[PDB]
Assembly symmetry: none
Homo-oligomer: 85 residues x 4
């Protein structure tokens, strides 16, 4: 039985794909709505890989899922590689 | 800055010592009471070491903290620690 | 008193750090050279975290440690640490 | 292809039953006999439940399989 806690973004996994896995598992998770809100607002960010997590934290609290997906969409892409270093 | 999510029982760490570290961080975590309750239900078990995690899950639901402490207490048995300042 | 069998990559532990812990324990393990060879061939992969393990297995046989680190790292990338005392 | 590394004695599992499961997986494990031998000397003890592991460690090196089974047998 796979726990939501076991869903962690892979080292080079696109954020969008991690989000799909996370929400698939979340839909199966036995937890109150309040806990699921904590899972989508906090756990999703905490279990992101170091590349995406840094980006997400800088967005600050209250970012929508859409905003998080926009923010990490470019990770591993040429724009991302080019901007550092 | 340490997240409750990152408090994980070391391979040779006495369960009671891990529980103390877990609750120390939990008290500092900024989450609702309902979320913290879920953390003691689920996250505390998830973050136990392999030797102990299997044992805890086999207890079934609703084990008291001392029953968990007892199930995973090692050289043992029950030990008592002074308060720290 | 850790065994090599106790060395497992944490869910957020950089693979490089895990490899360092693994080889530190390996150098102290009392096993034949053949068994230690097996430990770096198989045990190192088996005790990687689930997301990294899947990636490492998919590499096929004979990957170098460098190849394994690259595979379980993000965009940037290699990190660098001072030698310990 | 379950790994021998994942065969662990349950908290209420009779040691003899765990031994049976261990050796069934071991026969399927692809490793040299010397590695398999290290697995029976070390991994079998490492993956026993905590009380049994404590008992087996106290037995010291070189115990026969039947010594181990007597040591961890239930009542």
């Amino acid at each position: 039985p796979t726990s939501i806690l076991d869903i962690r973004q892979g080292p080079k996994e696109p954020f969008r794909d991690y989000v799909d896995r996370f929400y698939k598992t979340l839909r199966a998770e036995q937890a109150s709505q309040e806990v699921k809100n904590w899972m989508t607002e906090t756990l999703l960010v905490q279990n992101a890989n170091p590349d995406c997590k840094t980006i997400l934290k800088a967005l600050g609290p209250g970012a929508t899922l859409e905003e998080m997906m926009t923010a990490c969409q470019g990770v591993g892409g040429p724009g991302h590689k080019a901007r550092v270093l």
